[PDB]
Design a protein around this ligand. Structure first.
Ligand SMILES: C[C@@H]1O[C@@H](O)[C@@H](O)[C@H](O)[C@@H]1O
Ligand SMILES: C[C@@H]1O[C@@H](O)[C@@H](O)[C@H](O)[C@@H]1O
Ligand SMILES: C[C@@H]1O[C@@H](O)[C@@H](O)[C@H](O)[C@@H]1O
Ligand SMILES: C[C@@H]1O[C@@H](O)[C@@H](O)[C@H](O)[C@@H]1O
Ligand SMILES: C[C@@H]1O[C@@H](O)[C@@H](O)[C@H](O)[C@@H]1O
Ligand SMILES: C[C@@H]1O[C@@H](O)[C@@H](O)[C@H](O)[C@@H]1O
Ligand SMILES: C[C@@H]1O[C@@H](O)[C@@H](O)[C@H](O)[C@@H]1O
Ligand SMILES: C[C@@H]1O[C@@H](O)[C@@H](O)[C@H](O)[C@@H]1O
Ligand SMILES: C[C@@H]1O[C@@H](O)[C@@H](O)[C@H](O)[C@@H]1O
Ligand SMILES: C[C@@H]1O[C@@H](O)[C@@H](O)[C@H](O)[C@@H]1O
Ligand SMILES: C[C@@H]1O[C@@H](O)[C@@H](O)[C@H](O)[C@@H]1O
Ligand SMILES: C[C@@H]1O[C@@H](O)[C@@H](O)[C@H](O)[C@@H]1O
Ligand SMILES: C[C@@H]1O[C@H](O)[C@@H](O)[C@H](O)[C@@H]1O
Ligand SMILES: C[C@@H]1O[C@H](O)[C@@H](O)[C@H](O)[C@@H]1O
Ligand SMILES: C[C@@H]1O[C@H](O)[C@@H](O)[C@H](O)[C@@H]1O
Ligand SMILES: C[C@@H]1O[C@H](O)[C@@H](O)[C@H](O)[C@@H]1O
Lengths: 354, 354, 354, 354
């Protein structure tokens, strides 16, 4: 691989409804967003069936739950502007249809929820800088004007809350290194300057929090292995060295915190199957990669059910959505084999960044 | 103290709104519930002022946020039945007024949110058993019939979710020991038998989860010191030995997990001031108690703000509500001194259990 | 029990030879020290048989291995002075016979090895102060003059090295609280003042180091349960609060670090059997006490074999020495039942402190 | 670098005497072993001066302390056989002179102390297999016959005790991967088969134990960065995945456990200065490399003083021995600058393995 490569992304975006039922959003061959949901919040639940949102889209959809429980989806439209669509009430399958937020978008959208309940969206703009727009009141369809945070982005952005409520945003820069920028006060339009975390990454960054608060960032490196870095202090400026794990991965990674508080990472492996690694103890060393049977055609998307059980979604070779899950709420649980969520086929609508 | 004593409780119940603004509920000299809220989700925010709910009540109010963000308050009425009252929309100060759930109540109510989004209420009944009632659909004013879980209670119940979504309930039994009972499958009406955790407690139990998932229970013991016990496995049946901490406390304890993932406990101390202890490292030993200036007249009630800062509420000697908070989002932060939330005086409406 | 009680002590002192074979020292009905040793450094080894040192003694013997591998035993004589006796070569059963160190002794002796290879002995003196005497060159029969460290002792002293090489000494004071005093520079005659750790203890203190360097002290408390306190910093002045564990113990405790780095404590329990508790995780909570069959008549003495397996020695109701051990080098290993090390009967020669 | 490279080694071997004074052994331009020692066991001590052992040698010397405190040095002679030389008494500068152990040696010797007090030596033999020879009684000049453990070695061996007393040996194999072999019972001539740990290493392996017992192995990888792997169970067969740390190193690494129980690694960095990294918390992430001023011409050799302070030895550009050390017994201590241990110049006598 080359330094500027961006690894294959997940094929759906997934959210938990207010009652924790999973709901997935993807793009079909008609270039429209379709969605499907569990009928009850357990991995062995039936799914409702694929339902279409009218409208042609030009990016992967991003979804987040509002602080009042309503899901809200963001996508790039045929006019290269940002559009969004929301449930009109929590846990209800009635939606607003696509409404305009304007702007000029050159990446997939990334959404975060501030700790004061306001959604905030991050995108690469037409000048390749990071731009953002936010709800001006919690869970309300009232939005700010577009504002630039500068920089030069060569990946999609990834945003996450610090333990103290400050949003921090990660993105690859013009030198193919990982850069970041952060709120200097929680849920406030006061931001740091851009700072480099130095390495060279060949996927979008993936960010998760560990239980002692500190952010941990995962990405594929220049040698196509997983690498990761962590905050070691109480601020956004103190980071560990980068560490890599042996084993060639062929997609973006996906990270999840299991119900024992340890981190797990899933990625497509060198043999195009799903690979999994987990921390063997608190902060501990990482297990050897363990592989699941079955060739997959996307990065994994990983979610947790209402009983803590991990569930993984992938694109199959038939271009349909498949999933598997843990049989018990236990870190050593066995796993099911791939099952089909049939009814449509999916395409990768990710914005091509170069 | 005697084995059957129940330590002084907190004077208000506190919840975070959907936008994380704190809101407190207490009972005034007119025997009505009054409430007050931050105008912005920061500890140095102004408060809106005390507002009254019409209706005479006969217990401490319990409050919980629904899975759609709406606060909902539960109280015993003049007819000894359960009543409730809810925000009609998230982050809005419009309420439904008191509506009946019937039953016969002989304790303060305790509320929990199941991991499928349904509130569930636990009370001691007229036969001294544990009874419960639940929403039949998430965040909906549709409730089940009353059902008994048996047992004999001599304290108020305390409920908490396990990491796998199973509710577990703790209460003092007829032998003054701590007993517990739990769902055997997440958010399902399938329950274990009662089991004893053995000791002798002289306060209501206080339950919190640590980051690696396991529940930890705090209570005052027969010698009037703090004691605690923790889950050591992945189920509800494997517990540590009881440990005590030196230092006489004169109220129920209040526990919180700070933004570094460590536990802290607050209680009124032997000199009637607020005392604080914290874990010095992960699972680590506990610090010596540290005292704050000022005599207090209730147990503390502890909450966290949108930026992670801890805030503590107490009854003052003037029978009004006072609070203090951390100056920074940091475990070593200094603290403010007590400030008044003036406008009404408060009474302790806790149900007298004997 | 009363605040000034001193719990029953162990009946033998145990050391590892240079080749790690265990060797035990006790006092028989002739008031002489006898010793016995493993013939190979494994718990299932045969023992050589009881051999006598000529000479009448008036205290429990203390034993330590010199930095050149030779064992050396310290005891009070019929003249109330300190006497000692050493192997003339490592792993050899040829001894020097008792030689005088003079002084006036009113406690059992306590021995420590400085990190520069010099033995140092701590005793209560005729004025009830702490006195000490040391080798002036490593593993050499050249000793200093007696010197006083002051204080007023009401227990035997317990000494241990800090991670930085500073000896720290613990002893009960005139107020029945635990006091301590320490070298302010490693292996130097420069000492702190006495400082109180506050509580009230009813046994000799027992001190061990945990793997992250910090000392942890165990003792029986005024309510006859185990209590413990730990260093929380990098110096001798920063300590945790005291914690107790439920369960009445009827002897001094004995602590050991197992080969997983976790602490275990053994003590005679309320039913006069051997009880064991262990840390369930790093610094973690403590397990419920687990009991072994068989009534015992002393505190346990605990040692580790060359393969890490823990072995416990006690006085039986027949006034003989019994032991049991782990069947495998594993923290969850099963244990053998009590086996006899027959040939003599033993008496408790501990100095009666009041 | 190429897969078969072996990184530059340390220029001296270092041991602690029985009284913990450091003593270093190196080879001078006369091809003889010389040694020098601290006069007192503190890093700021004067050194005695360089003293010569008569005899021409053809390998780097290996040194270990016997279980009776006497140092003993092993080296290859002009006849390609193993020779050794020992202190005749602990802490004494009287030595036996070189005595033969025969055999045919094609690597530097590696020495370990069994947990029953017997030294054991590991070497690559004339057939490129691993061979060993051992004391038949603890700290006694009585040795076994040579015995083969098979395999094919392409590095020097590194040996370490497991927590349960089993020796485990690590060495690079014919495929340039790290292999290992272990005693299946403590201090017994019963060994496992060879097993591969898979990667590709370009230095000798370096092995250390962490406080919870488990071995951790460090080595330079094929991309010239540090990599490491750890035991995750209670046996020798359960290992983590390999992890690398960013940063090009140009020598073998040297590892030490500091007095807080955390691991630190030193290596010559890409700019030919001394680099240091440390674990920021228990098992935690690794710090960025920190560099010391001064170009160095060997790998570091690292030791600990009697007060816990770390001291580092390197070859300077003047071909003399230099060292620096921590100013205080604290993980955050500042460091001195390089100081000269003058009197001879040193050569790298490491056996050239190909
Ligand atoms: C997603 C939206 O779908 C239709 O409404 C188009 O008219 C818009 O341009 C946008 O593409
Ligand atoms: C995102 C960052 O923005 C500017 O700071 C550039 O100088 C960097 O190269 C990077 O692209
Ligand atoms: C990941 C899945 O694995 C197998 O089950 C295939 O039949 C599917 O098409 C898909 O590739
Ligand atoms: C809290 C409620 O307040 C009034 O509505 C009373 O009529 C009810 O009995 C109840 O006490
Ligand atoms: C809550 C418990 O209920 C029954 O099991 C009683 O036997 C116990 O004493 C306890 O009161
Ligand atoms: C806890 C508070 O402390 C002091 O400030 C008093 O003035 C208040 O009345 C209250 O007791
Ligand atoms: C232990 C010693 O034994 C004998 O040598 C006595 O003469 C001494 O007084 C001392 O008691
Ligand atoms: C050992 C200590 O010595 C002195 O400091 C006394 O004042 C204390 O009470 C204690 O006995
Ligand atoms: C601890 C031992 O337990 C039983 O085996 C008795 O027979 C012994 O006398 C001793 O009490
Ligand atoms: C190290 C030894 O030094 C001399 O004694 C030589 O005769 C030996 O062959 C050996 O090299
Ligand atoms: C040390 C090992 O010995 C044998 O097992 C070889 O097959 C391996 O390649 C390796 O060299
Ligand atoms: C490591 C040392 O660093 C400098 O002090 C040089 O003067 C020495 O020769 C040596 O290179
Ligand atoms: C998101 C922003 O929207 C605006 O319309 C553009 O002018 C900016 O370049 C940027 O793309
Ligand atoms: C809560 C339950 O309500 C019912 O009306 C009563 O009959 C029960 O005893 C119990 O009090
Ligand atoms: C140990 C010391 O020995 C001396 O002889 C005595 O004078 C002191 O009081 C003390 O007992
Ligand atoms: C160490 C062993 O010594 C013997 O003499 C040789 O025959 C073997 O090959 C091996 O070198």
């Amino acid at each position: 691989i080359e330094n500027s490569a961006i690894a294959l992304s997940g094929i759906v975006s997934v959210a938990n409804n207010a009652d924790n039922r999973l709901e997935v959003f993807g793009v079909s061959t008609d270039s429209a967003v379709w969605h499907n949901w569990q009928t009850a919040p357990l991995p062995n639940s039936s799914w409702a069936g694929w339902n279409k949102f009218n409208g042609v889209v030009t990016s992967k959809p991003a979804v987040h739950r509002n602080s009042d429980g309503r899901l809200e989806v963001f996508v790039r439209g045929t006019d290269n502007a940002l559009w969004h669509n929301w449930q009109t009430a929590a846990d209800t399958n009635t939606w607003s249809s696509w409404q305009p937020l304007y702007g000029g978008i050159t990446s997939n959208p990334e959404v975060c929820l501030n700790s004061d309940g306001r959604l905030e969206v991050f995108v690469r703009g037409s000048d390749n800088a990071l731009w953002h727009i936010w709800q001006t009141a919690a869970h309300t369809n009232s939005w700010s004007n577009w504002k630039s945070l500068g920089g030069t982005l060569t990946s999609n952005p990834a945003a996450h809350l610090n333990a103290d409520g400050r949003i921090e945003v990660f993105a690859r820069g013009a030198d193919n290194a990982l850069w970041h920028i952060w709120q200097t006060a929680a849920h406030t339009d006061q931001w740091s300057n851009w700072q480099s975390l130095k390495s060279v990454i060949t996927s979008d960054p993936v960010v998760i929090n560990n239980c002692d608060g500190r952010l941990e960032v995962f990405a594929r490196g220049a040698d196509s292995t997983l690498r990761h870095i962590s905050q070691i202090g109480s601020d956004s400026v103190s980071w560990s060295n980068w560490q890599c794990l042996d084993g060639v991965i062929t997609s973006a990674p996906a990270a999840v915190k299991n119900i024992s508080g340890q981190l797990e990472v899933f990625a497509r492996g060198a043999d195009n199957t799903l690979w999994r690694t987990w921390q063997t103890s608190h902060n501990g060393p990482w297990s050897n990669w363990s592989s699941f049977t079955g060739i997959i055609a996307s990065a994994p998307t990983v979610a947790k059910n209402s009983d803590g059980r991990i569930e993984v979604f992938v694109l199959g070779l038939d271009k349909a959505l498949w999933h598997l899950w843990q049989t018990t709420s236990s870190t050593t649980s066995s796993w099911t084999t791939w099952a089909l969520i049939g009814g449509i086929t999916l395409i990768d609508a990710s914005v091509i960044l170069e």
